[PDB]
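Bench log. Compound arrived from synthesis this morning; before running ITC I wanted a structural hypothesis for how 4,4'-(thiophene-2,5-diyl)dibenzoic acid sits in the protein. Inputs:
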Amino acid sequence: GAVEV
Amino acid sequence: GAVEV
Amino acid sequence: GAVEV
Amino acid sequence: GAVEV
Amino acid sequence: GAVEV
Amino acid sequence: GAVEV
Amino acid sequence: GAVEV
Amino acid sequence: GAVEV
Amino acid sequence: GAVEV
Amino acid sequence: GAVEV
Amino acid sequence: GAVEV
Amino acid sequence: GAVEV
Amino acid sequence: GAVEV
Amino acid sequence: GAVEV
Amino acid sequence: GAVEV
Amino acid sequence: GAVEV
Amino acid sequence: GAVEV
Amino acid sequence: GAVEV
Amino acid sequence: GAVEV
Amino acid sequence: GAVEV
Amino acid sequence: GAVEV
Amino acid sequence: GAVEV
Amino acid sequence: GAVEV
Amino acid sequence: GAVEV
Amino acid sequence: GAVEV
Amino acid sequence: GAVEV
Amino acid sequence: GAVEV
Amino acid sequence: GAVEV
Amino acid sequence: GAVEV
Amino acid sequence: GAVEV
Amino acid sequence: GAVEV
Amino acid sequence: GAVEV
Amino acid sequence: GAVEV
Amino acid sequence: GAVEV
Amino acid sequence: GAVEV
Amino acid sequence: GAVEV
Amino acid sequence: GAVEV
Amino acid sequence: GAVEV
Amino acid sequence: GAVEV
Amino acid sequence: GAVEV
Amino acid sequence: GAVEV
Amino acid sequence: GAVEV
Amino acid sequence: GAVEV
Amino acid sequence: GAVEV
Amino acid sequence: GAVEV
Ligand SMILES: *C(=O)c1ccc(-c2ccc(-c3ccc(C(*)=O)cc3)s2)cc1
Ligand SMILES: *C(=O)c1ccc(-c2ccc(-c3ccc(C(*)=O)cc3)s2)cc1
Ligand SMILES: *C(=O)c1ccc(-c2ccc(-c3ccc(C(*)=O)cc3)s2)cc1
Ligand SMILES: *C(=O)c1ccc(-c2ccc(-c3ccc(C(*)=O)cc3)s2)cc1
Ligand SMILES: *C(=O)c1ccc(-c2ccc(-c3ccc(C(*)=O)cc3)s2)cc1
Ligand SMILES: *C(=O)c1ccc(-c2ccc(-c3ccc(C(*)=O)cc3)s2)cc1
Ligand SMILES: *C(=O)c1ccc(-c2ccc(-c3ccc(C(*)=O)cc3)s2)cc1
Ligand SMILES: *C(=O)c1ccc(-c2ccc(-c3ccc(C(*)=O)cc3)s2)cc1
Ligand SMILES: *C(=O)c1ccc(-c2ccc(-c3ccc(C(*)=O)cc3)s2)cc1
Ligand SMILES: *C(=O)c1ccc(-c2ccc(-c3ccc(C(*)=O)cc3)s2)cc1
Ligand SMILES: *C(=O)c1ccc(-c2ccc(-c3ccc(C(*)=O)cc3)s2)cc1
Ligand SMILES: *C(=O)c1ccc(-c2ccc(-c3ccc(C(*)=O)cc3)s2)cc1
Ligand SMILES: *C(=O)c1ccc(-c2ccc(-c3ccc(C(*)=O)cc3)s2)cc1
Ligand SMILES: *C(=O)c1ccc(-c2ccc(-c3ccc(C(*)=O)cc3)s2)cc1
Ligand SMILES: *C(=O)c1ccc(-c2ccc(-c3ccc(C(*)=O)cc3)s2)cc1
Ligand SMILES: *C(=O)c1ccc(-c2ccc(-c3ccc(C(*)=O)cc3)s2)cc1
Ligand SMILES: *C(=O)c1ccc(-c2ccc(-c3ccc(C(*)=O)cc3)s2)cc1
Ligand SMILES: *C(=O)c1ccc(-c2ccc(-c3ccc(C(*)=O)cc3)s2)cc1
Ligand SMILES: *C(=O)c1ccc(-c2ccc(-c3ccc(C(*)=O)cc3)s2)cc1
Ligand SMILES: *C(=O)c1ccc(-c2ccc(-c3ccc(C(*)=O)cc3)s2)cc1
Ligand SMILES: *C(=O)c1ccc(-c2ccc(-c3ccc(C(*)=O)cc3)s2)cc1
Ligand SMILES: *C(=O)c1ccc(-c2ccc(-c3ccc(C(*)=O)cc3)s2)cc1
Ligand SMILES: *C(=O)c1ccc(-c2ccc(-c3ccc(C(*)=O)cc3)s2)cc1
Ligand SMILES: *C(=O)c1ccc(-c2ccc(-c3ccc(C(*)=O)cc3)s2)cc1
Ligand SMILES: *C(=O)c1ccc(-c2ccc(-c3ccc(C(*)=O)cc3)s2)cc1
Ligand SMILES: *C(=O)c1ccc(-c2ccc(-c3ccc(C(*)=O)cc3)s2)cc1
Ligand SMILES: *C(=O)c1ccc(-c2ccc(-c3ccc(C(*)=O)cc3)s2)cc1
Ligand SMILES: *C(=O)c1ccc(-c2ccc(-c3ccc(C(*)=O)cc3)s2)cc1
Ligand SMILES: *C(=O)c1ccc(-c2ccc(-c3ccc(C(*)=O)cc3)s2)cc1
Ligand SMILES: *C(=O)c1ccc(-c2ccc(-c3ccc(C(*)=O)cc3)s2)cc1
């Protein structure tokens, strides 16, 4: 996945 | 998935 | 999926 | 799906 | 689906 | 689908 | 899917 | 999927 | 998937 | 996957 | 995977 | 979805 | 959906 | 839907 | 989804 | 258990 | 269990 | 357990 | 497991 | 496990 | 394990 | 345990 | 383990 | 997803 | 344990 | 282990 | 995902 | 233990 | 081990 | 993922 | 232990 | 071991 | 991942 | 121990 | 995965 | 070992 | 994998 | 990963 | 011990 | 994975 | 061993 | 793997 | 993996 | 692997 | 792995 912050 | 914050 | 916040 | 908040 | 809040 | 609470 | 809480 | 809380 | 909190 | 907190 | 905090 | 056993 | 066993 | 066993 | 055993 | 929604 | 909605 | 939503 | 007051 | 007041 | 006030 | 959401 | 006030 | 045992 | 979200 | 105020 | 035992 | 998110 | 105020 | 025992 | 996120 | 204020 | 025993 | 993130 | 910050 | 203010 | 904090 | 015993 | 991240 | 900061 | 202010 | 902090 | 900073 | 701090 | 700074 890809967590973006 | 992709969590966006 | 995609959770948006 | 897509949860929006 | 799509939950909106 | 869609479900709240 | 989509689920809140 | 998508799940919040 | 995607999950917050 | 993707998970925050 | 991906995990924050 | 939302399972509460 | 929403299962409450 | 909403199952309450 | 969201399992609360 | 004892589920109170 | 004992489900109170 | 004892789930209070 | 069972609910009370 | 069971819920109280 | 069980919930109280 | 004792889950309070 | 169980939750209190 | 989000398991709360 | 005693999970408070 | 159990949560308090 | 997010397991809270 | 005693998890407070 | 258990959480306090 | 994110295990909180 | 006593995990406060 | 346990957390305080 | 991220284990917090 | 006593983990505060 | 890929965490971005 | 336990955390304080 | 990928994990922050 | 990141173990915090 | 007493881990503060 | 790949953590970016 | 335990952490203080 | 990959881990920061 | 590869941590970049 | 890869770990910073 | 490879940490880059
Ligand atoms: C060999 O067995 C093998 C198996 C899996 C892989 C993967 C490379 C990237 C993967 C991945 C990317 C992004 C996400 C989230 O969006 C999840 C997994 S798996 C390589 C070699
Ligand atoms: C080899 O067996 C293999 C299997 C799976 C993969 C994946 C690469 C990216 C994946 C992914 C991306 C994004 C999301 C969320 O949106 C979930 C999974 S799986 C690579 C190699
Ligand atoms: C190889 O076996 C394989 C299987 C699945 C995948 C996926 C790439 C992205 C996926 C995904 C994206 C977004 C969402 C939510 O909207 C859910 C799943 S699965 C790659 C390779
Ligand atoms: C390979 O087997 C495979 C299977 C499924 C997928 C998916 C990519 C995105 C998906 C998805 C997106 C959005 C939602 C909610 O709206 C649910 C699922 S599944 C990729 C590869
Ligand atoms: C491959 O097998 C595969 C199967 C399903 C999918 C999906 C992509 C998005 C989906 C979806 C979107 C929105 C909702 C709610 O409105 C429910 C499902 S399923 C991709 C690939
Ligand atoms: C060994 O042969 C083998 C079997 C399974 C896998 C996986 C590839 C991608 C995986 C994955 C990544 C991210 C997520 C996020 O939820 C879920 C699954 S497992 C590799 C090698
Ligand atoms: C094996 O290949 C396999 C079997 C099942 C799955 C699932 C991914 C998400 C699932 C799910 C989503 C939502 C709910 C109600 O929340 C229940 C199950 S099953 C992946 C791979
Ligand atoms: C195997 O390939 C497989 C079997 C089932 C699934 C499911 C994903 C989500 C499911 C679901 C959603 C919502 C509800 C009522 O909430 C019940 C089940 S089943 C994925 C893959
Ligand atoms: C296998 O491919 C498979 C079988 C069933 C499913 C389901 C996804 C959501 C389902 C569902 C939604 C809502 C309700 C009443 O809430 C009951 C079931 S079944 C996915 C994949
Ligand atoms: C084996 O190859 C295999 C079997 C299952 C899986 C799953 C990845 C995510 C799953 C899932 C997502 C969401 C929910 C309700 O949250 C339940 C299960 S199962 C990967 C690989
Ligand atoms: C069909 O196999 C089937 C479905 C459910 C069950 C259950 C065994 C124990 C259950 C339960 C225990 C405790 C509580 C809360 O106090 C709620 C449900 S359901 C057996 C067989
Ligand atoms: C058809 O197989 C079938 C469907 C449900 C069941 C159940 C076994 C135990 C159940 C249950 C236990 C405890 C509580 C709450 O106190 C609620 C349901 S249902 C068996 C067979
Ligand atoms: C079908 O095999 C089946 C499904 C569930 C169960 C359960 C065994 C113990 C359960 C339970 C224990 C404690 C609490 C909270 O106090 C809630 C559920 S469910 C057995 C068999
Ligand atoms: C089906 O095998 C099955 C599913 C769950 C269980 C459980 C054993 C202990 C459980 C439990 C203990 C404590 C708490 C919180 O106080 C919640 C659940 S569930 C047995 C068999
Ligand atoms: C073996 O090859 C194998 C089996 C399972 C897996 C999984 C990677 C991520 C999984 C998962 C993601 C999300 C959720 C609900 O959060 C549950 C499970 S299973 C990888 C490799
Ligand atoms: C099915 O084997 C199964 C699933 C869970 C369990 C559990 C044993 C102890 C559990 C537990 C202990 C303490 C707390 C918090 O106070 C929460 C859960 S679950 C046994 C068997
Ligand atoms: C053996 O080859 C094997 C078995 C499982 C795995 C997994 C890598 C990541 C997994 C996972 C990701 C996310 C979640 C919910 O967060 C649960 C499990 S399993 C790798 C290699
Ligand atoms: C199934 O084997 C199974 C799953 C979990 C367990 C547990 C034993 C002790 C547990 C626990 C102790 C303390 C705390 C926090 O106070 C939380 C969980 S879970 C046994 C068997
Ligand atoms: C043996 O060859 C083997 C077995 C498992 C593994 C894993 C590497 C990362 C794993 C994992 C990642 C993320 C999560 C949820 O965070 C859980 C497990 S398992 C490598 C080699
Ligand atoms: C299944 O074997 C299983 C899983 C976990 C355990 C645990 C033994 C002690 C645990 C624990 C001690 C202290 C704290 C924080 O105060 C948290 C967890 S879990 C036994 C058996
Ligand atoms: C033996 O050959 C062997 C077994 C396991 C491993 C692992 C390397 C990294 C692992 C891992 C990464 C991430 C997480 C969740 O962070 C859990 C485990 S296992 C190497 C060699
Ligand atoms: C399954 O064998 C298992 C897993 C964990 C344990 C633990 C023994 C002591 C633990 C612990 C002590 C102190 C603190 C912080 O105060 C946190 C965890 S876990 C036993 C058995
Ligand atoms: C040989 O067995 C083997 C197995 C897996 C790999 C991987 C190279 C990159 C991987 C990966 C990239 C990105 C992500 C997240 O997006 C997850 C896994 S696995 C090499 C050699
Ligand atoms: C024996 O040949 C052997 C067994 C395990 C290993 C490992 C090298 C790195 C490992 C690891 C990396 C990351 C994490 C979560 O950070 C956990 C374990 S195990 C080498 C040689
Ligand atoms: C399973 O054998 C197992 C895992 C961990 C332990 C522990 C013994 C002492 C522990 C501990 C002491 C002090 C502190 C910080 O104050 C944190 C952890 S863990 C026993 C058995
Ligand atoms: C020989 O057994 C072997 C097995 C694995 C590898 C890998 C080289 C790079 C890997 C990797 C790259 C990036 C990521 C994250 O995105 C995860 C794993 S595994 C070499 C030789
Ligand atoms: C000895 O024969 C043996 C068995 C396993 C391995 C591994 C190669 C790459 C590994 C690894 C690197 C980085 C990460 C990050 O999470 C996880 C696993 S273990 C070498 C030699
Ligand atoms: C011989 O047994 C052996 C096993 C593993 C290796 C590896 C060379 C590079 C590796 C690696 C690169 C990058 C990453 C992160 O992205 C993780 C592992 S493993 C050499 C020889
Ligand atoms: C002896 O025969 C033996 C068994 C395992 C290994 C390993 C080769 C590469 C390893 C490794 C490097 C870096 C990382 C980062 O997380 C994980 C595993 S262990 C050598 C010799
Ligand atoms: C003989 O047993 C043996 C085993 C492992 C190796 C390795 C050479 C380079 C390795 C490595 C490179 C880079 C990374 C991170 O990206 C991790 C491991 S292992 C040589 C000889």
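What the model suggests: The beta strands of chain AR are 3-4. Chains AR and Y do not touch (no CB pair under 8 Å).
ITC booked for Thursday regardless.
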